[PDB]
Amino acid sequence: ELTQPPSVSVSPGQTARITCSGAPLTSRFTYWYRQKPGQAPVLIISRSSQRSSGWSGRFSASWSGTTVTLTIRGVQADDEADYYCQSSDTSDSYKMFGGGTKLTVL
Amino acid sequence: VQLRESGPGLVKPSETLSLSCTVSNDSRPSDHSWTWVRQSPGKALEWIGDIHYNGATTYNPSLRSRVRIELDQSIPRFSLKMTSMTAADTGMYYCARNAIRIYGVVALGEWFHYGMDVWGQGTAVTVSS
Amino acid sequence: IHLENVTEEFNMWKNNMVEQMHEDIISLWDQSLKPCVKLTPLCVTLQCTNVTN
Numbered sequence: 001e002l003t004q005p006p007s008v009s010v011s012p013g014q015t016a017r018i019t020c021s022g023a024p025l026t027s028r029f030t031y032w033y034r035q036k037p038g039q040a041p042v043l044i045i046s047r048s049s050q051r052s053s054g055w056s057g058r059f060s061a062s063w064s065g066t067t068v069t070l071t072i073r074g075v076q077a078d079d080e081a082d083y084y085c086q087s088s089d090t091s092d093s094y095k096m097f098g099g100g101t102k103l104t105v106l
Numbered sequence: 107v108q109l110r111e112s113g114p115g116l117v118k119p120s121e122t123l124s125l126s127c128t129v130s131n132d133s134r135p136s137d138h139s140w141t142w143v144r145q146s147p148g149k150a151l152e153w154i155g156d157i158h159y160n161g162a163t164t165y166n167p168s169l170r171s172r173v174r175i176e177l178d179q180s181i182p183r184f185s186l187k188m189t190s191m192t193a194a195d196t197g198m199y200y201c202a203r204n205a206i207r208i209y210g211v212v213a214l215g216e217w218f219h220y221g222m223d224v225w226g227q228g229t230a231v232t233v234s235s
Numbered sequence: 236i237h238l239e240n241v242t243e244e245f246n247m248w249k250n251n252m253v254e255q256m257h258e259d260i261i262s263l264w265d266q267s268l269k270p271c272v273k274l275t276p277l278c279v280t281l282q283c284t285n286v287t288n
């Protein structure tokens with residue numbers, strides 16, 4: 001499956017980073033979502049064509065080994081939610097989710 | 107693009123499940139993917155299955171023995187057939203559109219998933235008596 | 236010039252027209268290959284990776 005930190009604490013204004021780890025992340029592509037409590041998930045990082053870094057706007061992500069770092073630039077107090085990395089298997093048969101990671105804002 | 111779910115609210119245990127999700131304001135409804143994903147309270151998300159308008163479906167293999175997803179395309183509303191409801195499946199369930207864009211021949215796999223852009227209403231799936 | 240009633244049997248499997256035609260083009264296409272660049276310094280220790288994305 002996937003591997004995440006359970007919760008990440010940071011003050012506003014700094015740069016919070018979340019490391020989604022897992023065995024399928026050797027090869028496959030990683031999603032990202034945002035879900036407010038009591039409401040729907042929101043796709044936050046999608047992808048373009050393959051050699052195009054997906055998309056770089058307000059967030060970014062790098063890759064090193066089986067770890068994928070979720071860079072959050074410019075933390076404020078309004079983005080408080082729970083976050084999720086998503087991928088599939090290298091065999092391309094089924095789709096799994098991350099464990100879930102709470103944003104803790106000071 | 108609009109979407110709305112459809113649910114009964116209260117379901118007894120050991121019975122079945124009939125859900126659907128109606129889609130409107132979609133200029134190309136025919137070339138996306140359509141999926142059910144559920145959520146338990148205070149838990150992670152939980153993918154269920156998916157359907158494409160060719161008729162090809164995949165499922166979560168652990169849940170595969172009790173589920174089925176089917177489709178009407180005239181009314182852009184795809185259904186949901188879960189059997190054998192248990193109280194552990196009490197949660198918040200979602201329909202969603204997983205978009206795919208095309209960079210060439212569809213039959214040769216020159217496409218990629220855009221990502222799941224549009225998320226459903228959510229329904230308080232209550233398995234109780 | 237159309238001819239009147241000549242019973243003649245062919246043999247498409249045994250003629251030298253096919254044999255010459257195979258010999259012509261190989262010699263002709265090799266003739267175009269002569270003044271071009273030789274270009275054999277590149278047979279060296281090439282090292283690569285996958286295209287990064």
Ligand SMILES: *[C@@H]1O[C@H](CO)[C@@H](O[C@@H]2O[C@H](CO)[C@@H](O[C@@H]3O[C@H](CO[C@H]4O[C@H](CO[C@H]5O[C@H](CO)[C@@H](O)[C@H](O)[C@@H]5O[C@H]5O[C@H](CO)[C@@H](O)[C@H](O)[C@@H]5O)[C@@H](O)[C@H](O[C@H]5O[C@H](CO)[C@@H](O)[C@H](O)[C@@H]5O)[C@@H]4O)[C@@H](O)[C@H](O[C@H]4O[C@H](CO)[C@@H](O)[C@H](O)[C@@H]4O[C@H]4O[C@H](CO)[C@@H](O)[C@H](O)[C@@H]4O[C@H]4O[C@H](CO)[C@@H](O)[C@H](O)[C@@H]4O)[C@@H]3O)[C@H](O)[C@H]2NC(C)=O)[C@H](O)[C@H]1NC(C)=O
Nearest residue numbers: 048049107132133134135138205207208209210211212213
């Ligand atoms: C052998 O036979 C084969 C047939 O079996 C044949 O295969 C065919 O090959 C060709 C090419 O090889 C394939 O053509 C591709 O088709 C793609 C899809 O095109 C369809 O979809 C678009 C999208 O329309 C959406 O939006 C409008 C509103 O604007 C709606 O009205 C639509 O209904 C639809 O809406 C849905 O999607 C929305 C967005 O998610 C949803 O929100 C919504 O709910 C809807 O559901 C349609 O518009 C197309 O119809 C016509 O319209 C456009 C308008 O300009 C015309 O230009 C077009 O030609 C159509 O006539 C069509 O139905 C295209 O995406 C793809 O084009 C991309 O690549 C080319 C070349 O690179 C680019 O020039 C082009 O600009 C596109 O590039 C963009 O997108 C790609 C995404 O991968 C990026 O890589 C690229 O960087 C660029 O991205 C940028 O723009 C994006 C959007 O603009 C943006 O999101 C990005 O972030 C970025 O900014 C290409 O044309 C064709 O599908 C094959 N068919 C099959 C069946 O396989 C083969 O060729 C034959 N071979 C031989 C030798 O004969």
Ligand SMILES: *[C@@H]1O[C@H](CO)[C@@H](O[C@@H]2O[C@H](CO)[C@@H](O[C@@H]3O[C@H](CO)[C@@H](O)[C@H](O[C@H]4O[C@H](CO)[C@@H](O)[C@H](O)[C@@H]4O[C@H]4O[C@H](CO)[C@@H](O)[C@H](O)[C@@H]4O[C@H]4O[C@H](CO)[C@@H](O)[C@H](O)[C@@H]4O)[C@@H]3O)[C@H](O)[C@H]2NC(C)=O)[C@H](O)[C@H]1NC(C)=O
Nearest residue numbers: 091092093094139140155156157158159160161162163164
């Ligand atoms: C000689 O020719 C004959 C006929 O001309 C050939 O026989 C045919 O062979 C076909 C493939 O070998 C076979 O098609 C399959 O049939 C089943 C049941 O009918 C169907 O489910 C299959 O559809 C899957 O596979 C195709 C291609 O792989 C996919 O395009 C399709 O979407 C389905 O794949 C999905 O499920 C897979 C399950 O493991 C996933 O791995 C896969 O990634 C994919 O998931 C994606 O697509 C889903 C749909 O969009 C989506 O929900 C999901 O999220 C992913 O995005 C396929 O149609 C024919 O049944 C068979 N016909 C007969 C009569 O036997 C024969 O092979 C040729 N001979 C030789 C030796 O090759």
Ligand SMILES: *[C@@H]1O[C@H](CO)[C@@H](O)[C@H](O)[C@H]1NC(C)=O
Nearest residue numbers: 052053056060061062287288
């Ligand atoms: C992705 O790669 C492209 C070219 O390979 C590069 O220009 C871009 O800065 C990279 N983006 C990230 C976020 O690493």
Ligand SMILES: *[C@@H]1O[C@H](CO)[C@@H](O)[C@H](O)[C@H]1NC(C)=O
Nearest residue numbers: 107108109130131132133224
């Ligand atoms: C559908 O929704 C879009 C926004 O995504 C809106 O601009 C458009 O007016 C709507 N279409 C109709 C026919 O109302």
